[PDB]
Design a binder for this molecule. Structure first.
Ligand SMILES: O=P(O)(O)O[C@@H]1[C@@H](OP(=O)(O)OP(=O)(O)O)[C@H](OP(=O)(O)O)[C@@H](OP(=O)(O)O)[C@@H](O)[C@H]1OP(=O)(O)O
Ligand SMILES: [Cl-]
Ligand SMILES: [F-]
Ligand SMILES: [Mg+2]
Ligand SMILES: [Mg+2]
Ligand SMILES: [Mg+2]
Length: 134
Protein backbone atom coordinates (compact mmCIF):
# COMPACT_ATOMS: atom_id res chain seq x y z
CA UNK A 1 0.00 0.00 0.00
CA UNK A 2 1.59 3.29 -1.23
CA UNK A 3 1.24 6.27 1.14
CA UNK A 4 1.16 9.99 0.42
CA UNK A 5 1.77 13.40 1.93
CA UNK A 6 -1.13 15.89 1.98
CA UNK A 7 0.09 17.36 -1.38
CA UNK A 8 -0.15 13.93 -3.14
CA UNK A 9 3.63 13.16 -3.09
CA UNK A 10 4.45 9.47 -2.50
CA UNK A 11 6.14 8.99 0.88
CA UNK A 12 9.50 7.09 0.63
CA UNK A 13 12.50 6.29 2.77
CA UNK A 14 16.03 5.21 1.88
CA UNK A 15 19.43 4.66 3.46
CA UNK A 16 22.93 5.57 2.48
CA UNK A 17 24.37 2.19 3.42
CA UNK A 18 28.02 2.90 4.26
CA UNK A 19 30.61 0.07 4.49
CA UNK A 20 31.99 1.70 7.72
CA UNK A 21 31.67 4.72 10.06
CA UNK A 22 34.25 6.43 7.70
CA UNK A 23 31.35 6.80 5.18
CA UNK A 24 33.83 6.37 2.22
CA UNK A 25 31.97 3.58 0.38
CA UNK A 26 28.21 3.24 -0.20
CA UNK A 27 26.07 0.37 -1.44
CA UNK A 28 23.99 0.91 -4.56
CA UNK A 29 21.55 -1.54 -6.10
CA UNK A 30 20.52 -2.18 -9.70
CA UNK A 31 17.38 -0.39 -11.02
CA UNK A 32 14.41 -2.77 -11.47
CA UNK A 33 13.29 -0.84 -14.68
CA UNK A 34 16.86 -0.90 -16.15
CA UNK A 35 19.31 -3.29 -14.44
CA UNK A 36 22.38 -1.74 -16.15
CA UNK A 37 21.68 1.42 -13.98
CA UNK A 38 22.38 2.06 -10.25
CA UNK A 39 20.10 3.56 -7.55
CA UNK A 40 20.08 4.18 -3.80
CA UNK A 41 17.97 1.46 -2.20
CA UNK A 42 14.64 2.77 -0.91
CA UNK A 43 10.92 2.55 -1.27
CA UNK A 44 7.43 3.40 -0.06
CA UNK A 45 6.53 3.97 3.60
CA UNK A 46 3.60 1.74 4.66
CA UNK A 47 0.59 3.15 6.51
CA UNK A 48 1.60 4.56 9.95
CA UNK A 49 5.20 3.30 9.29
CA UNK A 50 7.92 5.48 10.94
CA UNK A 51 10.33 6.78 8.20
CA UNK A 52 13.43 5.24 9.87
CA UNK A 53 11.58 1.86 10.08
CA UNK A 54 10.58 2.06 6.36
CA UNK A 55 14.22 3.00 5.42
CA UNK A 56 15.79 0.00 7.30
CA UNK A 57 13.08 -2.35 5.92
CA UNK A 58 13.48 -1.29 2.31
CA UNK A 59 17.30 -1.71 2.37
CA UNK A 60 16.93 -5.19 3.87
CA UNK A 61 14.47 -6.04 1.05
CA UNK A 62 16.38 -4.39 -1.80
CA UNK A 63 20.08 -4.58 -0.79
CA UNK A 64 20.13 -7.57 1.58
CA UNK A 65 21.92 -5.58 4.32
CA UNK A 66 21.41 -4.65 7.99
CA UNK A 67 23.32 -2.42 10.35
CA UNK A 68 23.35 0.52 12.81
CA UNK A 69 20.87 3.26 11.85
CA UNK A 70 22.51 6.65 11.90
CA UNK A 71 21.35 10.26 11.34
CA UNK A 72 18.60 11.59 9.04
CA UNK A 73 20.48 13.37 6.19
CA UNK A 74 17.34 15.25 5.09
CA UNK A 75 14.08 14.98 3.15
CA UNK A 76 14.37 15.04 -0.65
CA UNK A 77 11.65 15.77 -3.16
CA UNK A 78 11.48 14.60 -6.75
CA UNK A 79 9.18 17.12 -8.36
CA UNK A 80 9.01 15.25 -11.66
CA UNK A 81 8.05 11.91 -10.09
CA UNK A 82 6.08 13.41 -7.17
CA UNK A 83 7.84 11.74 -4.29
CA UNK A 84 9.36 12.85 -1.02
CA UNK A 85 12.10 10.61 0.47
CA UNK A 86 13.54 10.58 3.95
CA UNK A 87 17.25 9.68 3.66
CA UNK A 88 19.09 8.13 6.61
CA UNK A 89 22.64 6.91 7.18
CA UNK A 90 22.97 3.16 7.89
CA UNK A 91 26.41 1.72 8.86
CA UNK A 92 26.25 -1.85 7.41
CA UNK A 93 27.19 -4.60 9.88
CA UNK A 94 25.49 -7.59 8.17
CA UNK A 95 25.72 -8.57 4.49
CA UNK A 96 23.15 -11.29 3.67
CA UNK A 97 23.34 -13.73 0.74
CA UNK A 98 19.86 -14.42 -0.62
CA UNK A 99 17.84 -11.32 0.03
CA UNK A 100 14.29 -10.71 -1.22
CA UNK A 101 15.15 -8.80 -4.44
CA UNK A 102 18.18 -11.02 -5.31
CA UNK A 103 15.79 -14.04 -5.16
CA UNK A 104 12.76 -12.35 -6.78
CA UNK A 105 14.16 -10.09 -9.58
CA UNK A 106 17.95 -10.80 -9.54
CA UNK A 107 18.69 -7.31 -8.12
CA UNK A 108 22.46 -6.55 -7.94
CA UNK A 109 24.46 -4.62 -5.30
CA UNK A 110 27.93 -3.05 -5.38
CA UNK A 111 30.13 -0.83 -3.17
CA UNK A 112 30.99 2.63 -4.68
CA UNK A 113 33.40 5.26 -3.40
CA UNK A 114 31.11 8.29 -2.77
CA UNK A 115 32.50 10.26 -5.78
CA UNK A 116 31.71 7.27 -8.07
CA UNK A 117 28.18 6.76 -6.58
CA UNK A 118 27.50 10.45 -7.36
CA UNK A 119 28.76 9.84 -10.97
CA UNK A 120 26.56 6.79 -11.75
CA UNK A 121 23.38 8.30 -10.21
CA UNK A 122 23.71 11.71 -11.96
CA UNK A 123 22.07 10.84 -15.33
CA UNK A 124 18.78 9.13 -14.31
CA UNK A 125 18.78 9.82 -10.49
CA UNK A 126 20.05 13.36 -9.99
CA UNK A 127 18.02 13.76 -6.80
CA UNK A 128 19.70 10.57 -5.37
CA UNK A 129 23.11 12.04 -6.41
CA UNK A 130 22.13 15.11 -4.32
CA UNK A 131 21.68 12.89 -1.23
CA UNK A 132 25.57 12.89 -1.01
CA UNK A 133 26.04 16.72 -1.45
CA UNK A 134 26.53 17.48 2.33
O1 LIG B 1 11.41 -0.93 -8.14
P1 LIG B 1 12.25 -0.13 -7.17
O2 LIG B 1 11.91 -0.28 -5.67
O3 LIG B 1 13.75 -0.06 -7.41
O4 LIG B 1 11.97 1.47 -7.45
C1 LIG B 1 10.83 1.84 -8.33
C2 LIG B 1 9.85 2.67 -7.55
O5 LIG B 1 9.41 2.02 -6.34
P2 LIG B 1 9.87 2.61 -4.95
O6 LIG B 1 11.37 2.44 -4.67
O7 LIG B 1 9.37 4.01 -4.73
O8 LIG B 1 8.96 1.69 -4.04
P3 LIG B 1 9.11 0.14 -3.40
O9 LIG B 1 8.40 -0.62 -4.47
O10 LIG B 1 8.30 0.26 -2.05
O11 LIG B 1 10.69 0.04 -3.21
C3 LIG B 1 8.71 3.03 -8.43
O12 LIG B 1 7.79 3.88 -7.71
P4 LIG B 1 6.16 3.77 -7.76
O13 LIG B 1 5.75 5.05 -8.30
O14 LIG B 1 5.63 3.61 -6.31
O15 LIG B 1 5.84 2.43 -8.52
C4 LIG B 1 9.32 3.94 -9.50
O16 LIG B 1 8.31 4.52 -10.20
P5 LIG B 1 7.99 6.20 -10.29
O17 LIG B 1 7.41 6.70 -8.80
O18 LIG B 1 6.99 6.16 -11.34
O19 LIG B 1 9.31 6.94 -10.58
C5 LIG B 1 10.33 3.20 -10.39
O20 LIG B 1 9.75 2.14 -10.99
C6 LIG B 1 11.38 2.67 -9.50
O21 LIG B 1 12.22 1.86 -10.27
P6 LIG B 1 13.84 1.98 -10.27
O22 LIG B 1 14.21 3.29 -9.67
O23 LIG B 1 14.07 2.01 -11.82
O24 LIG B 1 14.35 0.73 -9.56
CL1 LIG C 1 33.06 3.37 4.45
F1 LIG D 1 9.36 -2.16 -1.88
MG1 LIG E 1 11.28 -1.79 -2.41
MG1 LIG F 1 12.31 0.76 -4.05
MG1 LIG G 1 8.12 -1.35 -0.81
Amino acid sequence: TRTYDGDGYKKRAACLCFRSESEEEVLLVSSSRHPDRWIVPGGGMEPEEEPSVAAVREVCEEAGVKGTLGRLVGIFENQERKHRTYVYVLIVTEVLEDWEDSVNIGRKREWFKIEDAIKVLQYHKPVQASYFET
